[PDB]
């Protein structure tokens, strides 16, 4: 399973803060073996994509259902692909929490974006729930070649990750197939710094991580080298 | 001296190549010097549409949340709206209220934060049929305009726009006296509760189904101060509803 480090800057930055994070990491050398991933702010997403270098690949926060309608305020997956974006997060702890959005809506956006040709990264976690999270995904996933699931444990140690992530690859195990199982990333979407990635990255079934305000800073670029 | 308002919503339609044509046809109109022109394309080409579109003619975002940065993946904030060089956020849409679900004091700090942030705010209410049918319809505007007015000090910035939702795909159609009758009261509800010189000042657009056969009647109606439009904005007919008071 190839290493994948998305961030995800969430709602934060300007052109000006933006564009220097950015430089950083054209600057900087990222592992081949690495498979790395930014998630601007949706204003954001054209922006990005044109300073970033094409090595690191651009997802959008969030998208619709559909791919155009009367929806003020949301943005379709071939809006994103027409941006050079080539991934959108779906169903993270936030959408889900503070903007309600159910588990229903989350497997209809995941199906859409799949069906444009974007990647998706699936997010599920807690407050018996995970699995149903993620039963929905899987219902609205025929192809698993594109898309990486990421477990948040919005409620927060390696050992309390690596032991979900089986349960988790356990799970695609029973439910979908020993293949998927075993070609599927489960990311981390817990706190994450500099300072924790490689014990965490070293965990067997953790295959990488959504980072979330490390992703803002310049030890994004040593969660990026977490396994080398 | 109201200066007439003509919003064009695009909603969640169009690509780069789409838009690019669209927005040359803009740059190319002919357009009054009395008219204000603004248009609110997906938030992932407010950056695109304000690079590509002359600069007399404004960009608003279509949404936006309520603190400058946080852990809200998926919004925007004021700050990044104006950092990209619109001056306009459209808060309260229908569909943002029926669709998604935004209660009205969510959309009132919304409200407060965007012009504290030095936007311009194109501040929309509206009943549903059900609401009408039940002759509700007073209620429902003037509650949802008081959310708005508490949260707003300096009304030189803020632009109201009513959205006969009772007409959208129900079959039902609003007349210019219908669309009068709803502004008047409105703009009453302004004078009761704000001030003679807010009530006097503050545009009032229309935001239900505006095509270039129907504005020049609608434009004409003292109480509407122009349009928010919906899909017109998409096609060259835009271009005659911004010359609707002619």
Known sequence: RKFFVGGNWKMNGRKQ???????????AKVPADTEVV????????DFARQKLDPKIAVAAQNCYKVTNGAFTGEISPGMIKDCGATWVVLGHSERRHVFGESDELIGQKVAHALAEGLGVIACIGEKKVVFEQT???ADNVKDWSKVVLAYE????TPQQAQEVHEKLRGWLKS???????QSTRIIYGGSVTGATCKELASQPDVDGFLVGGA???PEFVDIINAKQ
């Open 153 to 156: 444990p919005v409620w927060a």
């Open 17 to 27: 803060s933006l564009g220097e994070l950015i430089g950083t990491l054209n600057a």
């Open 215 to 217: 992703s803002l800073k």
């Open 38 to 45: 930014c998630a601007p702010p949706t204003a954001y997403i």
């Open 175 to 181: 439910n979908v197939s020993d293949a998927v199982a």
């Open 135 to 137: 039963k929905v995904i």
